[PDB]
Amino acid sequence: VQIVYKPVDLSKVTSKCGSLGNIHHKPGGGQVEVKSEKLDFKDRVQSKIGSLDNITHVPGGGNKKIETHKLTFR
Amino acid sequence: VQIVYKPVDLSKVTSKCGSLGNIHHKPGGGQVEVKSEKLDFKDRVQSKIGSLDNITHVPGGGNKKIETHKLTFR
Amino acid sequence: VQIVYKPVDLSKVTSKCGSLGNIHHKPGGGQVEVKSEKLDFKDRVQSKIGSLDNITHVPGGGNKKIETHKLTFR
Amino acid sequence: VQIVYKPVDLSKVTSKCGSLGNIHHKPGGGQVEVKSEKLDFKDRVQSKIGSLDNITHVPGGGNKKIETHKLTFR
Amino acid sequence: VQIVYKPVDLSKVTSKCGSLGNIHHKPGGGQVEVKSEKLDFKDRVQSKIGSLDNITHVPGGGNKKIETHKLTFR
Amino acid sequence: VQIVYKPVDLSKVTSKCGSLGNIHHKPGGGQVEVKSEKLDFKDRVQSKIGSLDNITHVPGGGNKKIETHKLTFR
């Protein structure tokens, strides 16, 4: 029995940009009220109960190569 | 039994951009009220119960390459 | 039994863009009330119960090559 | 010339109420822009431009009594 | 020329109430912009530009008696 | 010329209340911007520009009594 695993990667996940200033992020207020009486969370749980979340995201080259090379043998 | 696994990737997941400024994100307020009693979450749950979430997302190059090379053998 | 697996990729998942500014995102207020007595969630659940979510997305190159190379032998 | 002025009032402008109860006011706020270059207001101008106003007004007795007595002799 | 002025008032402008109870006021506040340039106002001008105003008014008796007696003689 | 001025008032502008109770005021505050370059206000100009105002007003007896007696003789 034999197994061979040689994934080759020569990829070039890259960016070019000019001037990037003058980004204004200016939230107002907000008011968040929560009760939570009897929660149970198990394994890979990703949870918000209450939220009032403000995001400015400006990567100037936001490129995302994503891979997975799962092999299984039984 | 012989297995030979050799993915190859030369990909140029890339961007070029000019001047990327003058972005204004100016969210107002918000009022979030939550009650939550007997919540039970398992295995892989991604959840929001009460949200008021604001996003400005300006990649300048939003390129995704997403892959999955799942091999299984019995 | 023998197996050979050689997926090649030479792609240019790419963008070019000029000046990319003058993006205004100005969410108002909003008001979210939630009660939840007896939620029960298992496996790959993606849930919003109450939400008031605002997105401005401006990728300058919003390309998404997406693949899957599932192989099985049983 | 004499002139006599003897107005009488006994107005029982009353109210009775029970319990002023479960009054909720929960506005999810809007979004406004105004661009008024030129405006020219003279005398009793009672004015609103680009308003987004929410009123709850819950008297235990809304009893206005308006009585604009006037006399002129020339 | 005599002139006799003797107004009389005995007004029970009264009120009665039970408990003033579970009054909740919960604004999720808005977003506003006002780019005015060259405004001009003279005398009793009563003015709002670009408002986003929230009111709960809950008097145990809003019993507004108003009695604007005027006399003018030449 | 005589002129006599003897206005009488006995107005019992009273109120009675039980418990002023569970009053909650919970604004999640908004966002405001103003750019007023030139303004020219003269005499009794009552003015607001770009307001975002939240009022809870809970008298146990809102009993206004306005009685603007006036006399002029020329």
Curated annotation (Swiss-Prot), chains A, B, C, D, E, F:
Tissue expression = Expressed in neurons. Isoform PNS-tau is expressed in the peripheral nervous system while the others are expressed in the central nervous system.
Q: List every position bearing Phosphoserine.
A: 19, 47, 51
Describe, as the record does, how this protein assembles with itself and its partners: Interacts with MARK1, MARK2, MARK3 and MARK4. Interacts with PSMC2 through SQSTM1. Interacts with SQSTM1 when polyubiquitinated. Interacts with FKBP4. Binds to CSNK1D. Interacts with SGK1. Interacts with PIN1. Interacts with LRRK2. Interacts with LRP1, leading to endocytosis; this interaction is reduced in the presence of LRPAP1/RAP.
Which residues form the Glycyl lysine isopeptide (Lys-Gly) (interchain with G-Cter in ubiquitin) crosslink? 6, 12, 16, 26, 38, 42, 48, 64, 70
**Location in the cell:** Cytoplasm, Cytosol; Cell membrane; Cytoplasm, Cytoskeleton; Cell projection, Axon
Which windows of the sequence hold Tau/MAP repeats? 1-31, 32-63
Q: How is it modified after translation?
A: Phosphorylation at serine and threonine residues in S-P or T-P motifs by proline-directed protein kinases (PDPK1, CDK1, CDK5, GSK3, MAPK) (only 2-3 sites per protein in interphase, seven-fold increase in mitosis, and in the form associated with paired helical filaments (PHF-tau)), and at serine residues in K-X-G-S motifs by MAP/microtubule affinity-regulating kinase (MARK1, MARK2, MARK3 or MARK4), causing detachment from microtubules, and their disassembly. Phosphorylation decreases with age. Polyubiquitinated. Requires functional TRAF6 and may provoke SQSTM1-dependent degradation by the proteasome. PHF-tau can be modified by three different forms of polyubiquitination. 'Lys-48'-linked polyubiquitination is the major form, 'Lys-6'-linked and 'Lys-11'-linked polyubiquitination also occur.
Q: Which residues carry this modification: N6,N6-dimethyllysine?
A: 6
Q: Which residues are glycosylated?
A: 42, 48, 64
What is the protein named?
Microtubule-associated protein tau
Q: Which disease is it linked to?
A: In Alzheimer disease, the neuronal cytoskeleton in the brain is progressively disrupted and replaced by tangles of paired helical filaments (PHF) and straight filaments, mainly composed of hyperphosphorylated forms of TAU (PHF-TAU or AD P-TAU). O-GlcNAcylation is greatly reduced in Alzheimer disease brain cerebral cortex leading to an increase in TAU/MAPT phosphorylations.
Gene assigned in the entry: MAPT
- Site features described as Not glycated, chain residue numbers: 6, 12, 16, 26, 35, 38, 65, 70
Question: Which residues are reported to carry the modification N6-acetyllysine?
Answer: 6, 12, 16, 26, 38, 42, 64
